[PDB]
Design a protein around this ligand. Structure first.
Ligand SMILES: OC[C@H]1O[C@H](O)[C@@H](O)[C@@H](O)[C@@H]1O
Ligand SMILES: [Ca+2]
Ligand SMILES: [Cl-]
Ligand SMILES: [Cl-]
Ligand SMILES: [Cl-]
Ligand SMILES: [Cl-]
Ligand SMILES: [Cl-]
Ligand SMILES: [Cl-]
Ligand SMILES: [Cl-]
Length: 244
């Protein structure tokens, strides 16, 4: 149930050949045969990669093989990666290399605590749903708009690191595989998440005074076979909340 057209898999399609590429590469992104480097380990970069077509699956699960790694000493690295399922695509900006006031879903892999009064241990993975009205407060690591999150040790690991994002029937689940255990450990599991079909998958990274290599190695999108019993492209991104 792999959907190849919404995936990035080695050998990358159209790279070193006449075949149709499936992704657009934007900003500081460096394309090599063995990784897509959203930013090099250099300051003040914004790079992204965006699926060349929109996704109309109602129920899906994206697996991302990524690598964040750099030569910054002690805590002097940043800023992280965002994964996107959004109305718009290709616009750079302050939100891990991509535009603010976005429409849809963001999954942030934040590696630098901008918030001087933070309670979190970094890196910190969180999710945000936006109808266009919200601005991600980068200076505060998105504190005001975070729906859920978990600390996650993903930098400079000696083995492969993966993230899974599952969306089906209003349930959004983010899982990690960072500890070389060939298993999905839960990070976030929330319900009442409303997203339309017809949005774009993408990934972006950003660096400022602090930097890191932010690599995407592969992205594999799976269609979930889930029963349904409305115009799904017109659903406004939103979240419904269980009452107290
Ligand atoms: O890179 C770390 C840091 O560098 C600068 O201070 C700014 O660009 C911040 O937004 C960024 O988070
Ligand atoms: Ca941050
Ligand atoms: Cl590809
Ligand atoms: Cl490089
Ligand atoms: Cl800041
Ligand atoms: Cl915020
Ligand atoms: Cl770290
Ligand atoms: Cl390690
Ligand atoms: Cl893990």
């Amino acid at each position: 149930h792999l959907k190849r057209e919404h995936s990035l898999i080695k050998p990358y399609q159209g790279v070193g050949s006449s075949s149709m590429p499936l992704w657009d590469f934007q900003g500081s992104t460096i394309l090599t045969s063995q990784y897509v480097r959203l930013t090099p380990d250099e300051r003040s970069k914004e790079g992204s990669i965006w699926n060349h077509q929109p996704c109309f699956l109602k129920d899906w699960e994206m697996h991302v093989h990524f690598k964040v790694h750099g030569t910054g000493k002690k805590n002097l690295h940043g800023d992280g990666i965002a994964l996107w399922y959004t109305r718009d695509r290709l616009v750079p900006g302050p939100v891990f290399g991509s535009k603010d006031n976005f429409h849809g879903l963001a999954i942030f892999l934040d590696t630098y605590p901008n918030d001087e009064t933070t309670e979190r241990v970094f890196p910190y993975i969180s999710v945000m749903v936006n109808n266009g009205s919200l601005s991600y407060d980068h200076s505060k690591d998105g504190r005001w708009t975070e729906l859920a999150g978990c600390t996650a040790d993903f930098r400079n690991r000696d083995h492969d690191t993966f993230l899974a994002v599952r969306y089906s029937r209003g349930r959004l689940t983010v899982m990690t595989d960072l500890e070389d255990k060939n298993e999905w450990k839960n990070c976030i599991d929330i319900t009442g998440v409303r997203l339309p079909t017809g949005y774009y998958f993408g990934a972006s990274a950003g660096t400022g005074d602090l930097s890191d290599n932010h690599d995407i190695i592969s992205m594999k999108l799976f269609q979930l076979m889930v029963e349904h019993t409305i115009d799904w492209t017109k659903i406004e991104p939103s979240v419904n909340f269980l009452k107290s």
